[PDB]
């Protein structure tokens, strides 16, 4: 990043996690939303129009981020995470999504996911004879209460 | 047939801003030296001339290009205000060249290109004070018209006498000072306006803003359209309302009128040339031709003709047609196709074998008339 | 623009802003809307049809314009703008969207966005190994109370 | 020309331009193309084959003409024309493609190329050491709206 | 050069670079390409054929130039340039393509290749036993943003 001209590229997205999500394919659905509000009023006892107040500022939204593990293997890392929550333990954890530069030693952007994050879904891919380009991917859905840069 | 050959025919002695630039002759409160005619905007104009303190008409006619459509205009100063002779028909609003000195006057503008109209706001400024006899006025208006005829690409704005009824204008028009020329036009009623330096009213000639309209008109539509219905922005009122029984007598003799219309405001209505020649009766037609000439002459500007040769004829024919076909594609010309809409000819019959010095003869047809 | 024939081209859209949105990819969702109204009546005690009055004229609509920054970099310009609003300060600002001519010194069209404009969203792109043509774009959503030419 | 039978031969292409280019070898792909459009319409309530309206008359197509200059030289003529274009300084030209018969004095065919004449591409030839049969040619590609016979 | 008529011939391509390559046979596919864009517009409320705006003026295209080295040798020059690129160590170079003609002292044409010049591909020739006419050539493909005459 010697010039203002480059932008971060999909070089090496990776994750800080205590659960061994060691190798991944991709990360998606990541966003930051502040909810707005809208009120319309009539003006102060005179011949002018009403006003629109859109400078009102309600709280911050929460969501979840899709995580795709390349595929099934013999190591049931995500399966146990979901089992602990189904069993009733508040088995949540902090996570860190990292964006990395062309020269990988440079790691400028990180997003902190709240300690209350947890897994609600595990989804299998389709298994069909002869598909060839279908390679048993797994989709993990994690709820993120709060995301901070 | 207007020149279709050259800037000059017998001798090849010769070896932008747009139609909105015009020139005005009159006195300044202060002003620069009077000879170096300058062209500028209101903002700089007032800084050099003065805030109406001299009681001169240029101070007000200048707004014609600033409180109405415009950009910049040329001003000939003549001389300035007395503290705290110029009223003669010889100096100032006169052909006051100075024996090839380009001194203030119609002569001082001979060396200046890019002028479409010339006005003389102070000619009648001293009509009463300077005893400007009728001829003293007539001689100047004739000098202005002649100037315009000689330059060939600009027209004269002619003022009516200061205060008279319809009968009296029918009189000077037909009996004492008709001018009969394709290079001039006149409007009749005087316009009431104010003067912020001291108060609510002054009377001014139907110029200034009246000319501001031409600049506005050219921006709205091609010069082909006449400003036969347009608002004299900045006007307050008119000295007289001229009724239909009077319009019946004045329009046939080339006198344009401005009227207060019941629901439309103060507008210019007449649009005739102060000329006896049927061909040039309409102002917008006379203007269309000056418009085409300025642009085509600047475009095909080659200096010192090398060899009289068909190859040059071909370059010329091709360039003139390329220019004119757009007038047809656009709404300016009449006809179902270029075939009828316009005509260009340049070959050995316009440029015969004698080939003496300048050739480059191009014959052209507009709608009906031929150049 | 020597002729009536040309039209403005996507030569150089740019923006007046105090927040350093120095380089951009694009601007979208820009519109001007006056709300209409529709009433139907029966005619004046005679054998003629009713009328439709659609010359009624309610007030002017407000919206937001999408802004896309080429991509993530180490300079967190937009992130702080959204943080200030989430924190509760009415951190709004005036903006100017400029349309530029082929010969760029000519800058004929400008749209003024009201001083009450603010950022409600920051959205990340997808991060997937090997995508190559996916280059970590960021989407910024700004609410514009009033837009004037 | 001297006889009713003979067909013009390749004596020489010749060009008018406001740019002082001097010598060329050829002119390619010159054409006059009108667009065709059509419909199928059923007959006059008689079970007879319908009609093919193949004489509907559309507008005229636009294209470009390619020229090859005899070769590279120290001249900057084609380079500067394209530089004005790339720089955004409108600088179109009026062209005239001329065919001269066995008689160089006789120039019976001349084609108008609208002033639009605008250079878009300049292409170099191949530089291969030892390929002692080749000279370096330049290709100039000029786009035009209208061609008139 | 000595006469007004002659066209430059393939005397030699020659190159400036910050990398010490020594001998080549050729340079392919060098071009200057401006992008064209257009519209069709209806006439001034007159039933006359509309106009084709074919002089709208877009930005300039970017491409790459292919070179062939005389042949494989023990030199590692082209290999290391590509290795820095693949390793993520920005290492672009400034190039100068010079078509020296006749007098090697006289170099009338020199083309600038922006520093972002960056090697993307290295391709080997075919190795066939007994094909005793062939030598092994190397193909180096270099991408560039900007070329200036």
Author numbering:
A (entry chain g), C (entry chain h), D (entry chain c), E (entry chain b): 1 to 149
B (entry chain I): 1 to 15, 28 to 96, 232 to 518
Paper excerpt:
In general, CIS are composed of a contractile sheath that surrounds an inner tube loaded with effectors, fitted with a baseplate complex. A conformational change in the baseplate complex triggers the contraction of the outer sheath, which leads to the propulsion of the inner tube into the target. Similar to the recently described sheath structures observed in AlgoCIS15 and tCIS19, the CISSc sheath is composed of a single protein, Cis2.
Next, we optimized the purification of CIS-N5 particles and performed cryo-EM. Helical reconstruction was used to generate an EM map, which we then used to build de novo the sheath-tube (Cis2-Cis1a) module in the extended conformation at 3.9 Å resolution. Domain 3 of the extended sheath (Cis2) was again too flexible to be resolved. The tube (Cis1a) structure and fold are highly similar to the tube structures already described for other CIS. The introduction of five extra amino acids in the CIS-N5 mutant induced conformational changes at the Cis2 N terminus, similar to a previous report.
